[PDB]
Amino acid sequence: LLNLQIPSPTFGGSTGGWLRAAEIEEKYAITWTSKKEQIFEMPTSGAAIMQKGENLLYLAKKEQCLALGTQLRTLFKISDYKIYRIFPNSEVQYLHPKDGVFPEKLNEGRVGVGNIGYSIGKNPNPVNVKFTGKNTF
Amino acid sequence: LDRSEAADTWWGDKDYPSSVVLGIGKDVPSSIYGVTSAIAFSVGAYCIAQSNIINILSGSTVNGFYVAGALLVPYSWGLHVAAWIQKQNGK
Amino acid sequence: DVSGLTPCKDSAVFKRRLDGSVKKLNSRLANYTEGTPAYIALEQQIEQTKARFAKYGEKGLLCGADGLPHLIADGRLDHAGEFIIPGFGFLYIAGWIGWAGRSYLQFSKKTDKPNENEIIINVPVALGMMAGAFIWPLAAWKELIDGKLLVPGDEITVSPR
Amino acid sequence: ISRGSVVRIMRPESYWFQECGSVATIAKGGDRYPVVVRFEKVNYAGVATNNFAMDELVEVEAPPA
Amino acid sequence: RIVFGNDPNYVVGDHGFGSNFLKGKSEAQIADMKLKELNNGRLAMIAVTGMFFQISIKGNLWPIIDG
Amino acid sequence: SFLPSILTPLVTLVFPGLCFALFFVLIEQDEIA
Amino acid sequence: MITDGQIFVALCIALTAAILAIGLGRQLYV
Amino acid sequence: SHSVRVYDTCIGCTQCVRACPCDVLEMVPWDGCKAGQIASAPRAEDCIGCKRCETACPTDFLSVRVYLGSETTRSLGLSY
Amino acid sequence: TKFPKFSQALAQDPATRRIWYGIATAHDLESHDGMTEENLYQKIFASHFGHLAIIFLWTSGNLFHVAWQGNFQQWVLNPLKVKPIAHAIWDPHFGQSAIKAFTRGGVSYPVNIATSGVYHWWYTIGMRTNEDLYFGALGLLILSTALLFAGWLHLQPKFRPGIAWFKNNESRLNHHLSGLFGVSSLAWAGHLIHVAIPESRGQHIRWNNFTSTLPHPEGLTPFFTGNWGLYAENPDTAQHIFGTSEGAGTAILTFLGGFHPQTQSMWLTDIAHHHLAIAVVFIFAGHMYRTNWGIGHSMKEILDAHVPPKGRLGSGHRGLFETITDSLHMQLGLALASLGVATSLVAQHMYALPSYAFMAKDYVTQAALYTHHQYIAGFLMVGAFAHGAIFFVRDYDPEVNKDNVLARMLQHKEAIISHLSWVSLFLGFHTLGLYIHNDVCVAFGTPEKQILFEPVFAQFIQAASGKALYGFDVLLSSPTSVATVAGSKIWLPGWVEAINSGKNSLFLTIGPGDFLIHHAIALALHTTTLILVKGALDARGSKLMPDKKDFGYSFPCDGPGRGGTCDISAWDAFYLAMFWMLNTIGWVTFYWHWKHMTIWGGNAAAFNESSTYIMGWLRDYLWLNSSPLINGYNAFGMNAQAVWAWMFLFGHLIWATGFMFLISWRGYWQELIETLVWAHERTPIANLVKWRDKPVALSIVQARLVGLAHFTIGYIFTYAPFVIASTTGKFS
Numbered sequence A: 001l002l003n004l005q006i007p008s009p010t011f012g013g014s015t016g017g018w019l020r021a022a023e024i025e026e027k028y029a030i031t032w033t034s035k036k037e038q039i040f041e042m043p044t045s046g047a048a049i050m051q052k053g054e055n056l057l058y059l060a061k062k063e064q065c066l067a068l069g070t071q072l073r074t075l076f077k078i079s080d081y082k083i084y085r086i087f088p089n090s091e092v093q094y095l096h097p098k099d100g101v102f103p104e105k106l107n108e109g110r111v112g113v114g115n116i117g118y119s120i121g122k123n124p125n126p127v128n129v130k131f132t133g134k135n136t137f
Numbered sequence B: 001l002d003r004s005e006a007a008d009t010w011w012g013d014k015d016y017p018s019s020v021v022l023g024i025g026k027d028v029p030s031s032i033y034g035v036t037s038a039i040a041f042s043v044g045a046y047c048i049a050q051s052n053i054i055n056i057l058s059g060s061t062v063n064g065f066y067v068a069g070a071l072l073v074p075y076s077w078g079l080h081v082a083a084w085i086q087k088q089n090g091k
Numbered sequence C: 001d002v003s004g005l006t007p008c009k010d011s012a013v014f015k016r017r018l019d020g021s022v023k024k025l026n027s028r029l030a031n032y033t034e035g036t037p038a039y040i041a042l043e044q045q046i047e048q049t050k051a052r053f054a055k056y057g058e059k060g061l062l063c064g065a066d067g068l069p070h071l072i073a074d075g076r077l078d079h080a081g082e083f084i085i086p087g088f089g090f091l092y093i094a095g096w097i098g099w100a101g102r103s104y105l106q107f108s109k110k111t112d113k114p115n116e117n118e119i120i121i122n123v124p125v126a127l128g129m130m131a132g133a134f135i136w137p138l139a140a141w142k143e144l145i146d147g148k149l150l151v152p153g154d155e156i157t158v159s160p161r
Numbered sequence D: 001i002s003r004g005s006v007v008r009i010m011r012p013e014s015y016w017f018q019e020c021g022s023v024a025t026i027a028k029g030g031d032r033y034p035v036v037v038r039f040e041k042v043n044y045a046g047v048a049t050n051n052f053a054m055d056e057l058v059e060v061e062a063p064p065a
Numbered sequence E: 001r002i003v004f005g006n007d008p009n010y011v012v013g014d015h016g017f018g019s020n021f022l023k024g025k026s027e028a029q030i031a032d033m034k035l036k037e038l039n040n041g042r043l044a045m046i047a048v049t050g051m052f053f054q055i056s057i058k059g060n061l062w063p064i065i066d067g
Numbered sequence F: 001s002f003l004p005s006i007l008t009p010l011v012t013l014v015f016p017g018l019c020f021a022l023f024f025v026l027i028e029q030d031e032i033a
Numbered sequence G: 001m002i003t004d005g006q007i008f009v010a011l012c013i014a015l016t017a018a019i020l021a022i023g024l025g026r027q028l029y030v
Numbered sequence H: 001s002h003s004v005r006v007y008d009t010c011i012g013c014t015q016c017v018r019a020c021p022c023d024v025l026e027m028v029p030w031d032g033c034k035a036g037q038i039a040s041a042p043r044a045e046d047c048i049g050c051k052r053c054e055t056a057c058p059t060d061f062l063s064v065r066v067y068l069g070s071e072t073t074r075s076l077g078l079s080y
Numbered sequence I: 001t002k003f004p005k006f007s008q009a010l011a012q013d014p015a016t017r018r019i020w021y022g023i024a025t026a027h028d029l030e031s032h033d034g035m036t037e038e039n040l041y042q043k044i045f046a047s048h049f050g051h052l053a054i055i056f057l058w059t060s061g062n063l064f065h066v067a068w069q070g071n072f073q074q075w076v077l078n079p080l081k082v083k084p085i086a087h088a089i090w091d092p093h094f095g096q097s098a099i100k101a102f103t104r105g106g107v108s109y110p111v112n113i114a115t116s117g118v119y120h121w122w123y124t125i126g127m128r129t130n131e132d133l134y135f136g137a138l139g140l141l142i143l144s145t146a147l148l149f150a151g152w153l154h155l156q157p158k159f160r161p162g163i164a165w166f167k168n169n170e171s172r173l174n175h176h177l178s179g180l181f182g183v184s185s186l187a188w189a190g191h192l193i194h195v196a197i198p199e200s201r202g203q204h205i206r207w208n209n210f211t212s213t214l215p216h217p218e219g220l221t222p223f224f225t226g227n228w229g230l231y232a233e234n235p236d237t238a239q240h241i242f243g244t245s246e247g248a249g250t251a252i253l254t255f256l257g258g259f260h261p262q263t264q265s266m267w268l269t270d271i272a273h274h275h276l277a278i279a280v281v282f283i284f285a286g287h288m289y290r291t292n293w294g295i296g297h298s299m300k301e302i303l304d305a306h307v308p309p310k311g312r313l314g315s316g317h318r319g320l321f322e323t324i325t326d327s328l329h330m331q332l333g334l335a336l337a338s339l340g341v342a343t344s345l346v347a348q349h350m351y352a353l354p355s356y357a358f359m360a361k362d363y364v365t366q367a368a369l370y371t372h373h374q375y376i377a378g379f380l381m382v383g384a385f386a387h388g389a390i391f392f393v394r395d396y397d398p399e400v401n402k403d404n405v406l407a408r409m410l411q412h413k414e415a416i417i418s419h420l421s422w423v424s425l426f427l428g429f430h431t432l433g434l435y436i437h438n439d440v441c442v443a444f445g446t447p448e449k450q451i452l453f454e455p456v457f458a459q460f461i462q463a464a465s466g467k468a469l470y471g472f473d474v475l476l477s478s479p480t481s482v483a484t485v486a487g488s489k490i491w492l493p494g495w496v497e498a499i500n501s502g503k504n505s506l507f508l509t510i511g512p513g514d515f516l517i518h519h520a521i522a523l524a525l526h527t528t529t530l531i532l533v534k535g536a537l538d539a540r541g542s543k544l545m546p547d548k549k550d551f552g553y554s555f556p557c558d559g560p561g562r563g564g565t566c567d568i569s570a571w572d573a574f575y576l577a578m579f580w581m582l583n584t585i586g587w588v589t590f591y592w593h594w595k596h597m598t599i600w601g602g603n604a605a606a607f608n609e610s611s612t613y614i615m616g617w618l619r620d621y622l623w624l625n626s627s628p629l630i631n632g633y634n635a636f637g638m639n640a641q642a643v644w645a646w647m648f649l650f651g652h653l654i655w656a657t658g659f660m661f662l663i664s665w666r667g668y669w670q671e672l673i674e675t676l677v678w679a680h681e682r683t684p685i686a687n688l689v690k691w692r693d694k695p696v697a698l699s700i701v702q703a704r705l706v707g708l709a710h711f712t713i714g715y716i717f718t719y720a721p722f723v724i725a726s727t728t729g730k731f732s
């Protein structure tokens, strides 16, 4: 799944990193490849240097990982980023490019989840679903 | 009283209400309704006039049979509305 | 006479107020010498105060116990000038303004660029609408009769009920 | 209704509900909402066009000649 | 507790006080005796009520308690 | 009387403090297994 | 002049009300 | 977690997925739209509720809609 | 099994918002997990029982404290000089100076001076000794005990009422009008005639001798013979002294009208006759509806067939019975609106027609009661509108209300809102313009230019009621009028002297200041109604959010899309209208307090001259009357009003603290709390102590609620010390 021995970017440390919850609930990792060693901005405050070749970074939020991925995509054109969720049991769950391509590109292997068959303003009224466990959507 | 135990009295489409709205008075003829309405209004007006206007109402002496009958003016109003309802119902 | 008030002509408190104002200015007058701009200006002030009080007395205003004019606005024509005549004057002017605005909007929409016509006013025709709005009560009645004042009801958006 | 026509919107949830709009395109085949009505009155998002179904539109003025 | 409890075996008016005499008697006799108890209580509820009022307003019962 | 001295601190310091302690512990009780 | 015994019997009735209030609160919770 | 829904007024503009900062949304094939795709939310548990999808949606009213609900660590977006 | 057991979502919530939302949704039983209608109704019934128990406990506590620590017996002898005592003070923070200052009221210990009028009420209804108050407190305690037992009992399985029984409207309305209103009012009339009139006339009627003592010398023989005028014959004389047999009559039911001259309060015989007559009317009213026999009415039939011809009001009132009997929020809103109107009515009537002996001269109690009941009226009105909005967003069924009188409100809500906006704008523009015109005219030393409009229509109504100083000479003011002739023999001989007497608050004289402030009050009422009506009608949806009903009643927003959607939920229309409720009741109470302070001081010219401009309002009412309050404690010493001064500054502080929550919003505080979390987790020693719920900033709606509560509480706690302390210090 994940090597856990990839060299990480050169960074001098910061106080925006994980604090006692990533090591007990869940951490996140993001791994990418860079053609040149170069300076980028961490989602946490600070400037790091991504190394030549493979790079691995740790974070506390899927939002932080996605923000870094967007930064890499629209500044350095690195689209080989892949994101994992690491549990305290060391289980690793590969998350963001789940089908191997980004969500924007269409793939035939994706099944519709949360798709409604009518327009937005045709939901039942709250009085209809009163005293029932369902909701108006 | 339950929601089921209630007759359908809505008459928005129709031009006049059904006689079921009169309750016990549904079967009362319109002529009887009208004449009783006239008698009731006359008697109630007479009673109020003799209680308050012709004799100024004194706390020591009030007749009581004039206080009664003064309520027939609302009763006369209801009776003439029911007279109209029965006239339009043809009953 | 209405509501226990009396005219300001025979109002001792009104006269006392007039004398108090006059005495206050004449006192302040002591600082300045004769013939100076400030002295003549204060003389104008005293004359205007006396003229205002005389005019208020002559106009027939009712003065209360506090010795100030009280306006009666109920409909009586004895006191029409207080509210009824100014009321009709304002109604005419306000309808003039509203009619000029409405007619200019009707023109500006028909234009090729209504959005730019609203922030850059076509003054040559706008002045025309301001002038033509003088006869708004007849124009409004005519448009109402012709069904052009009101937009029908189901041609105007309305939110989901 | 037809290209170049003016149609009144009847979708209750639309910003332009019970307002006129110029039809710009009708898509054939799929397109559950095939008509493409363009307005001059921007909504809150700022868009001035939207797709609509056949029954959601009411014909008020046919196209020119 | 036995009043507002959920005891399914509880019989109404069966508190166990003096219940030993009902062992000998039969169910028809039990019903007759309970009915006699109920009738006597029903009479006494109204009687007493009278008594109290007679003592309150007259100060004495008619056939007894002369003063 | 002495009832004010006996009761006001008892009902305004001891009882509310115990109530706050009990409420805190109860809200921090976890789900049963 | 309200007596100490009067205050005490009133306090006893108040304590009875407290017990009933606790019972009512428990029954409302369940 | 919040409930993300997509209604059939979609026009496959793929802008909700671009605005998405948590990879909650993705395009899946569809018949109704001419573009042949519709937004879908297979990872609603990762939703935080900033409604950038709703902001980016160009329909007259939102084809993609987010209903806020049960809060979690992920939904609250707590780094601690 | 977390604390919000009723809400599994909040139970799984890991942050500190779990506690807040559980506490604030504890009583929202309709939205609880696994809830049924029958259980909802039964739980509501039990909570009602507990609430009644709390009310009776509060009353018993007041009675017990006055009996034990109050100077009721001393106050009875000299009501107009002795200050009533509420309860004793026990405070180990008091200094010797504080103990000396608070020692007052003819007692040897610190005390609080009652400002609720309970002394006057109990004296009027016939309490004369501390023993009577103590026994009343015991009775109320036993009643609370019984009510708590009933609340416990009716949650039991065999004693749980059913949904049909709960929804039996006809029987409930019949009994709650013929017994709860009618028979209870008859009982109060009986209490008056048996205990209160004899005590005011110098007779000690108590439980040990009320059976023996006859209320009237004739007994019930006049009642059964029909010679009912014997009970009105021989009324109390104008030389009567309250509580003494000298100058006392024998009438028990009269219609004298006016006021008792010594006490300047209404006659107890008049009050007894009032309650008897209204009890008769209520008992007659309570036989209207059909319950088990055949006679009566069906409310469903009445509502269904009340539809005007040609569809004027659409389909009429069809379906309203179903919606009202199904939705508890509509019933709650109707009850709250009716009770708010009633609270405004009692506030307006207690001062105009005082019923309790010697309350007219007790200026502090009058102002306290008026302010109290006006504030509660405002709260109840806002609650009525809020629950109407909740009904619209939660319980409204358009299928049932297909073209209903209620649905047409939603149909022309745009017209309603636009016209409310128009009237609010007109009133505000012209009232503020006239006020500023008067301000500038007085500021430039020329008050003669003020636009002073006489309230001619209100003065006309006063003249029609019987006022004569205006000289309108209409209706009762005209001696020749048929109305005066008709009423001349029952109540007008007392009413005319009462209204024309200048020493009374009955139909106060009015002027341009009254005109302007009344139009300001109209502005405030119309604006509050605008906000509340718009919230209620747009709760279901709007052009910016047609699907608002899906989100519900109280949600934060819809996000920054579509230009921003702050305060769109129609709970935020409660929040925003609470500010206007506080504003309008504040204006009303300012008006009442100043117009009464000047009249108590015999200086009504000050109000008539200075109330026409805002500088006069700020100078002659707030600045002038704030001195005795702020001087409660100073560098040189302290007085008994030091507690009131402290509270004025405390209410100021709470009001100012509300602004923090109302202005600063959540993201700043969330980032700040993140920094604090970092600091706590990274410091040594303290990091061993670790939270269980992750600390988070307060939610948007939570902080709106907290800021509004701070605003409101600071409002009341900074106005109450003013209205009480200034009135006490001036004693006028």
Ligand code: CLA
Residues within 6 Å of the ligand: B058, B059, B060, B061, B062, B063, B064, B065, B067, B068, B071, I226, I227, I228, I229, I231, I232, I253, I254, I255, I256, I276, I277, I278, I280, I281, I284, I490
């Ligand atoms: C049982 C209750 C009760 C009692 C004991 C009294 C006693 C008295 N009233 Mg009455 N009064 C009552 C109820 C009662 N009132 C009600 C309900 C009202 C209507 C609001 C009034 C309104 C009233 C007025 C306006 C006046 C009195 C006055 C009097 C005195 C003489 C009345 C007389 O001789 O009547 C003798 C009459 C009878 C023996 C027969 C009465 C039968 C009635 C009319 C039956 C129908 C009642 C009706 C349906 C109820 C609703 C009210 C309706 C009239 C609108 C006496 C002190 C006078 C007074 O004290 O002046 C100083 C006076 O001016 N009363």
Ligand SMILES: CC(=O)O[C@H]1CC(C)(C)C(=C=C/C(C)=C/C=C/C(C)=C/C=C/C=C(C)/C=C/C=C(\C)C(=O)C[C@@]23O[C@]2(C)C[C@@H](O)CC3(C)C)[C@](C)(O)C1
Residues within 6 Å of the ligand: E017, E018, E019, E021, E040, E041, E043, E044, E046, E047, E048, E049, E050, E051, E054, E061, E062, E063, E064
């Ligand atoms: C340890 C111990 O003890 O165990 C117990 C256990 C157990 C089972 C409980 C037992 C039992 C049985 C018990 C307890 C039996 C008790 C029986 C009892 C005590 C029964 C009274 C009836 C009274 C009536 C009907 C009154 C009518 C009254 C009426 C109708 C009147 O006189 C009317 C009248 O007065 C008015 C109103 C007014 C006057 O003007 C006129 C008169 C006077 C005419 C045991 C076995 O024995 C022992």
Ligand SMILES: CC1=C(/C=C/C(C)=C/C=C/C(C)=C/C=C/C=C(C)/C=C/C=C(C)/C=C/C2=C(C)CCCC2(C)C)C(C)(C)CCC1
Residues within 6 Å of the ligand: G008, G009, G011, G012, G014, G015, G017, G018, G021, G022, G024, G025, G028, I047, I050, I051, I053, I054, I057
């Ligand atoms: C002297 C004496 C004594 C003692 C006493 C005491 C110790 C007392 C105490 C007392 C007390 C200490 C009291 C208290 C009370 C309380 C109360 C009375 C309360 C109530 C409450 C309530 C009513 C509530 C309600 C509610 C709520 C609020 C919430 C939830 C729900 C409910 C509804 C439940 C003795 C016995 C030895 C002997 C005799 C004498």
Ligand SMILES: CC1=C(/C=C/C(C)=C/C=C/C(C)=C/C=C/C=C(C)/C=C/C=C(C)/C=C/C2=C(C)CCCC2(C)C)C(C)(C)CCC1
Residues within 6 Å of the ligand: I329, I330, I332, I333, I334, I337, I341, I381, I384, I385, I387, I388, I389, I391, I392, I536
């Ligand atoms: C939203 C909503 C709601 C709410 C509402 C409200 C909150 C309301 C209120 C309302 C109100 C709060 C009203 C009031 C009114 C009043 C009136 C209407 C009055 C009248 C009066 C009269 C008629 C009088 C007369 C007289 C007499 C009798 C004697 C002396 C003289 C005179 C003339 C004064 C609900 C829940 C329903 C639901 C639905 C929706």
